[PDB]
Design a protein around this ligand. Structure first.
Ligand SMILES: *[C@@H]1O[C@H](CO)[C@@H](O)[C@H](O)[C@H]1NC(C)=O
Ligand SMILES: *[C@@H]1O[C@H](CO)[C@@H](O)[C@H](O)[C@H]1NC(C)=O
Ligand SMILES: *[C@@H]1O[C@H](CO)[C@@H](O)[C@H](O)[C@H]1NC(C)=O
Ligand SMILES: *[C@@H]1O[C@H](CO)[C@@H](O)[C@H](O)[C@H]1NC(C)=O
Ligand SMILES: *[C@@H]1O[C@H](CO)[C@@H](O)[C@H](O)[C@H]1NC(C)=O
Ligand SMILES: *[C@@H]1O[C@H](CO)[C@@H](O)[C@H](O)[C@H]1NC(C)=O
Ligand SMILES: *[C@@H]1O[C@H](CO)[C@@H](O)[C@H](O)[C@H]1NC(C)=O
Lengths: 596, 201
């Protein structure tokens, strides 16, 4: 009869014939990942092509129902998701050119091998050949050689490709009623039509700047401490008044500072909380790691894993004969099939990863009752944040003592908490200026604020102004320094990590307040708390049915992303860093004072 | 009295093939002795929910006829085979009356009704103009008209096929795995009741 009833019947027809096709595609992808064989690759490609063609035909059928005559929020949300053109609005020649550009950038990044001139008999790939050198070397010129050579080869190859990529993506976005590709990426957080819970695409940049202005004092103190330690490690290169050299941050791009924990440790003589030897002594299998994670999730009140999870998941490396992707991944295959693909070792990192991926599985299981096209996170941040909170809770000394992995007479003094908080800062706080600067630079490139001849002069200017990292030697416009990173070269959004980081500690404060923890936030464990699990599950069950603002209201009681829980998490570290930086100078100068 | 001629419950529960929920099989059971304790004491059934009568006194009471309705549905749709429920199965496939006396027996059939490629032999009615009456069977395959346009026989835009296949894989979740449902309907009519329970000695 009415347009709304027509859309509801069409959506029923879609969800029914799309859940099975998605299950076939996902099952083929699983069979490829657990068994890398050419026929499995062909089956995966065929299933993916069928899925994409079916989505194209359903989108083409879906556009015929106008949005303004539908009042039900869920029906409108599913129709909005289905009616997106994507790259389909663009011409076939330009679409094929864009796909070719994406594929060739993927091949250049994945198969890029660079080694020293005059010694070309063997060369090192990015993973793990260059990663180990960046993470473990203590030599200035070796790191400088690796960094400059990789940005020389990769940037000089990728610069014309990126110049074509920005124009094509802007063309697609303006054809799709967006201002630029940056607006297209920011449209994930767009909420329209809900009274009071509305969120605009333009509000995201303002909120990110507003949060980052409060991030900046903690990052300045952390940067000053890291600068002093790196000055100790490398005597003459680093200046007391200037920025950090780019190739000394412990990673290839500066994404994480977690590889500097050995150099920048506050109290090296004091022990760490490594529990690897304890699990090795007690013969903990990977099955026991996942069972302990399951015990943690049943302790907080969430449902336990399905029979299909235990039967169908691959929690151990299969062998030499059978090839598999080693990356830990939680798979929501469809029709109630939830699996974890992880090559689990007996390490703390794998145990925390198991908690993180089982958190992803719990999030996927919670919204299984929702319609098919609304089975996602409310935004890109929540899905990763719900795993990171489990990683946070499991890594606490109280949880380790509770599960028996740590001695009950282990002394938790302030020095161990300080060094643990510094490691969490190097991983978590250090990625925030890099993430914000990269996304702001990409948004300004898409918006046209930066002309093509001034991309790098602005970029280093942004990096000095925001990240406090200086280039070792000047780079001209023949370089394409941003595109050496995996996410930007392969067309991925990067603001998800910033939003994930803020949502992580907002959720952590909400659950810890729910769990009646009375101490510091970093010492909080959410086990044994049914009410915290209920508060989490209220948001978890919604999926993409409700706006992310309403979901955040459901958990923390706020309608917007907030920065105060993160600063409250690192308050002991903030006071300690402020005390330790009395002799040194907090803050940096954007001039070329260390080296250029 | 020495008793023989037990009711043929083997040809309903232990059938090699079950019917689809749109075309659910109805078998009228008459002129025999119905031993219901064999069904109740089995551990193979996940749901044995009896509405309007209790399983303990079934082996004593006597009924004119027993109607065994047999079909296959999903795991999450077993809840809808009850009086007063709402869903695709209740509205469009199999509708139970509110004043229903009988038992709904359901068990998991992932072993038999699921194959590695996918078992698509079981179909369900997804759209109908109106809800079904109690104990009605609709096996019509006429194109559903969701929009003003005359469908005219062709499956195009706003016109959908009402019978949609089901996908059964052995690796599916428990809420998507096939469940064989047998609904026994007990009625007493003015004719002499012939389906009586066995008299114990
Ligand atoms: C992996 O693929 C090989 C080759 O097709 C096959 O023989 C083997 O049984 C497969 N193993 C698994 C676990 O799927
Ligand atoms: C929206 O549609 C759903 C069906 O998916 C229905 O259950 C819900 O009640 C509807 N909401 C409103 C406000 O009409
Ligand atoms: C998708 O593209 C078609 C064809 O250009 C157009 O008619 C339709 O309005 C577009 N829809 C959206 C949501 O951009
Ligand atoms: C999960 O929990 C339920 C109820 O607590 C229990 O019946 C079931 O056996 C558990 N799963 C496993 C694999 O033990
Ligand atoms: C830890 O506590 C002791 C006891 O008061 C104090 O002397 C010491 O300075 C503290 N260390 C830090 C890093 O706060
Ligand atoms: C959580 O509950 C279990 C079972 O009662 C108990 O053994 C465990 O110690 C509890 N956790 C804490 C931190 O007390
Ligand atoms: C049906 O199959 C089961 C499986 O062993 C068997 O025990 C039972 O006797 C059979 N017949 C009936 C009426 O349940």
């Amino acid at each position: 009869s009415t347009i709304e009833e027509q859309a509801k019947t069409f959506l029923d027809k879609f969800n029914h014939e799309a859940e099975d096709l998605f299950y076939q595609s996902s099952l083929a992808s699983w069979n490829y990942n657990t068994n890398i064989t050419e026929e499995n690759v062909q089956n995966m490609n065929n299933a993916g092509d069928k899925w994409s063609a079916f989505l194209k035909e359903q989108s083409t059928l879906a556009q015929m129902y106008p949005l303004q005559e539908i009042q039900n929020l869920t029906v409108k949300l599913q129709l909005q998701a289905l009616q997106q053109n994507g790259s389909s609005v663009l011409s076939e020649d330009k679409s094929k050119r864009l796909n070719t550009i994406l594929n060739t950038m993927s091949t250049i990044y994945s198969t890029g091998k660079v080694c020293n001139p005059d010694n070309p008999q063997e060369c090192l790939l990015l993973e793990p050949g260059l990663n180990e050198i960046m993470a473990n070397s203590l030599d200035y010129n070796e790191r400088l050689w690796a960094w400059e050579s990789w940005r020389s080869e990769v940037g000089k190859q990728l610069r014309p490709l990126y110049e074509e990529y920005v124009v094509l993506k802007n063309e697609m976005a303006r054809a799709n009623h967006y201002e630029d590709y940056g607006d297209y990426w920011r449209g994930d957080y767009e909420v329209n039509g809900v009274d009071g819970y509305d969120y605009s695409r333009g509000q995201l940049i303002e909120d990110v700047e507003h949060t980052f202005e409060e991030i900046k004092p903690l990052y300045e103190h952390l940067h000053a401490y890291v600068r002093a330690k790196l000055m100790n490690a490398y005597p003459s290169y680093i200046s007391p008044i200037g920025c950090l050299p780019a190739h000394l941050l412990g990673d290839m791009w500066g994404r994480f500072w977690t590889n500097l924990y050995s150099l920048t440790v506050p109290f090296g003589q004091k022990p760490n909380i490594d529990v690897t030897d304890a699990m090795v002594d007690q013969a903990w299998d990977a099955q026991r790691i996942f069972k302990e994670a399951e015990k943690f999730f049943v302790s907080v009140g969430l449902p336990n894993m399905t029979q299909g999870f235990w039967e169908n998941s691959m929690l151990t490396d299969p062998g030499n004969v059978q090839k598999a992707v080693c990356h830990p991944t939680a798979w929501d295959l469809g029709k109630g099939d939830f699996r974890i693909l992880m090559c689990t070792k007996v390490t703390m990192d794998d145990f925390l990863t198991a908690h993180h991926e089982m958190g992803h599985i719990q999030y996927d299981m919670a919204y299984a009752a929702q319609p098919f096209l609304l089975r996602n996170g409310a935004n890109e941040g929540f899905h990763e944040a719900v795993g990171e909170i489990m990683s946070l809770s499991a890594a606490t000394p109280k949880h380790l003592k509770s599960i028996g992995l740590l001695s009950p007479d282990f002394q938790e003094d302030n020095e161990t908490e300080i060094n643990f908080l510094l490691k969490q800062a190097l991983t978590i706080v250090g990625t925030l200026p890099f993430t914000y600067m990269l996304e702001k630079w990409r948004w300004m490139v898409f918006k046209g604020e930066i002309p093509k001849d001034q991309w790098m002069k602005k970029w280093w200017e942004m990096k000095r102004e925001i990240v406090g990292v200086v280039e070792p030697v000047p780079h001209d416009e023949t370089y394409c320094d941003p595109a050496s990173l995996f996410h930007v070269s392969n067309d991925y959004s990067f603001i998800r990590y910033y939003t994930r980081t803020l949502y992580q500690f907002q959720f952590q404060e909400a659950l810890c307040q729910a769990a009646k923890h009375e101490g510091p936030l970093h010492k909080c464990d959410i086990s044994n708390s049914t009410e915290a699990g209920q508060k989490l599950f209220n948001m978890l069950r919604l999926g993409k049915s409700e706006p992310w603002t309403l979901a955040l209201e459901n958990v923390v009681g706020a309608k917007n992303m907030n920065v105060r829980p993160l600063l409250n998490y690192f308050e002991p570290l903030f006071t300690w860093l402020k005390d330790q930086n009395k002799n040194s100078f907090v803050g940096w100068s954007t001039d070329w004072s260390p080296y250029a | 009295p020495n008793i023989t001629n037990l009711c043929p419950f083997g040809e309903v529960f232990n059938a090699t093939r079950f019917a689809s929920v749109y075309a659910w099989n109805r078998k009228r059971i008459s002129n025999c002795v119905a031993d219901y304790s064999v069904l109740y004491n089995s551990a193979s059934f996940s749901t044995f929910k009896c509405y309007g009568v209790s399983p303990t006194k079934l082996n004593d009471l006597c009924f004119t006829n027993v109607y065994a309705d047999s079909f296959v549905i999903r795991g999450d749709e077993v809840r809808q085979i009850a009086p007063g429920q709402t869903g695709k199965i209740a509205d469009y496939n199999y509708k139970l009356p509110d004043d229903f006396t009988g038992c709904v027996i359901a068990w998991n059939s992932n072993n038999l009704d699921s194959k590695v490629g996918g078992n698509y032999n079981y179909r369900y009615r997804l759209f109908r103009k109106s809800n079904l009456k109690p104990f009605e069977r609709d096996i019509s395959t006429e194109i559903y008209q969701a929009g003003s346009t005359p469908c005219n026989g062709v499956q195009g835009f706003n016109c959908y096929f009402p019978l949609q296949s089901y996908g059964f894989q052995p690796t599916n979740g428990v809420g998507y795995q096939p469940y064989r449902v047998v609904v026994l309907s007990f009625e007493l009519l003015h004719a002499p009741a012939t389906v009586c329970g066995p008299k114990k000695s």
